[PDB]
């Protein structure tokens, strides 16, 4: 175990070239972290309830603007040159109809 913890830490660090990413600004998933305390012998039902609370908070209410336009897309799309309305693409301002 003392050699594997060294041989695992060889792939992890790479301190000489760039950096170790800061753990304070990175975020953990429940994911990998729930398996780690099992190998130490700690229980998870004390920590499982905190996941059960906040996942009851985040879930979706589906407000009215997400109702009609879930599949509906490109409401009055732009032109061939991609210009705005008040932008005056000087090639196509001559002929108004698109067949010309």
């Amino acid at each position: 175990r003392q050699k594997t913890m060294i041989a695992e830490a060889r792939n992890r660090k790479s301190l000489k070239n760039k950096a170790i990413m800061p753990r304070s600004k990175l975020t953990k998933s429940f994911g990998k972290m729930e398996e780690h305390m099992s190998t130490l012998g700690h229980d998870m039902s004390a920590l499982q309830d905190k996941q059960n609370r906040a996942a009851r908070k985040n879930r979706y209410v589906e407000r009215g603007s997400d109702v009609v336009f879930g599949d509906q897309d490109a409401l009055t799309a732009s032109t061939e040159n991609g210009v705005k309305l008040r932008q005056t693409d000087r090639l196509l301002d001559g002929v108004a109809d698109g067949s010309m």
Binding site: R90, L91, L92, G94, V95, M100
Partner: protein
């Protein structure tokens, strides 16, 4: 040259407005023999000599 004269800057303005392709409605006129802009200028290709 970033310290240019107004005599020099007055001619860059004419060179910018001549830097455009031909309008799409002149393609359609009667007896149009004009096809492409031929006095068109690039900065990488041809220097305009002040």
């Amino acid at each position: 040259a970033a310290q240019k004269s107004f005599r020099i800057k007055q001619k860059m303005a004419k060179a910018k407005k001549q830097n455009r392709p031909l309008p799409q409605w002149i393609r359609l006129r009667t007896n149009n023999t004009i096809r492409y802009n031929a006095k068109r200028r690039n900065w990488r290709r041809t220097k305009m000599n002040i």
